[PDB]
A paper describes a structure:
An X-ray cocrystal structure of acyclic inhibitor 8 and Mcl-1 was obtained and is illustrative of the potential benefits of macrocyclization in this series. Two copies of compound 8 bound to Mcl-1 were present in the asymmetric unit, with unambiguous electron density maps of the ligand molecules suggesting two different binding poses of compound 8. The superimposed structures of these two ligand binding poses show a different orientation of the indole 2-carboxylic acid moiety while the other parts of compound 8 remains the same. Figure B,B1 show the favored binding pose, which represents the conformation adopted by the indole 2-carboxylic acid moiety of the ligand in the majority of the cocrystal structures we have obtained in the program. This binding pose provides optimal overlap between the Arg263 residue and the indole ring resulting a cation–π interaction. Additionally, the 2-carboxylic acid moiety forms a polar interaction with the Asn260 side chain. However, as we occasionally observed in our X-ray cocrystals, the ligand may also adopt a binding pose where the indole 2-carboxylic acid is rotated 180° around the C–N amide bond (C1). This binding pose is accompanied by a modest shift in the left-hand portion of the Mcl-1 loop region to accommodate the 2-carboxylic acid moiety, which now forms a hydrogen bonding interaction with the Val258 backbone NH. Inspection of the cocrystal structure of 8 and Mcl-1 shows there is an accessible shelf region that is already partially occupied by the indole 2-carboxylic acid N-substituent (N-ethyl methyl ether in the case of 8) that the tether could occupy.
Author numbering: 172 to 321
Amino acid sequence: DELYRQSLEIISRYLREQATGAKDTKPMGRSGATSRKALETLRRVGDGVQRNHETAFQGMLRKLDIKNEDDVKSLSRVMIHVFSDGVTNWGRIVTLISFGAFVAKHLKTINQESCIEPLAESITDVLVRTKRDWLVKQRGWDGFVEFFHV
Ligand SMILES: COCCn1c(C(=O)O)cc2cc(C)cc(N3C[C@@H](C)n4c(c(CCCOc5cc(C)c(Cl)c(C)c5)c5ccc(Cl)c(-c6c(C)nn(C)c6C)c54)C3=O)c21
């Protein structure tokens, strides 16, 4: 319903902005405040996650050997495997998206900007499908911004 659309808007905006390598502060949609604040939080926490896990991110990127949109279509399986284990929390969700931004920068490097939208959708699809009930219990992105945004 609303949860998918809002998630996709947040994730797509962050991956896109990360790939161009400058912030975009165009406002969001109707639920403008929450989505804006979630995006600001992703910039802060997400950028730190990428720095912290530079090595593992780099090693994993290399093993994924991404070239084109067909590869992008084939990322979902490893993504699901690595994320749908065990504990759910917002830090883990930021880690999933942060790895998404890391790949999106690579896609830019190899002139595969067309793939960034499919990537974001694939991330959103996995997030909302596997964690729907938990996300609803937290009041979704409101729960994220309420407690994590500074
Ligand atoms: C130890 O953690 C087990 C899993 N886990 C549990 C739990 O209970 O299982 C709780 C918990 C809490 C947090 C905050 C984080 C983790 N992690 C820590 C590690 C295991 N991770 C996690 C993620 C996020 C989920 C997948 O995102 C993806 C996103 C995209 C766009 C693609 Cl295309 C793909 C293929 C994957 C990682 C992403 C990349 C790497 Cl490179 C590592 C990564 C790092 C870093 N080091 N190494 C060796 C790898 C392989 C990742 C994760 O969710 C947690």
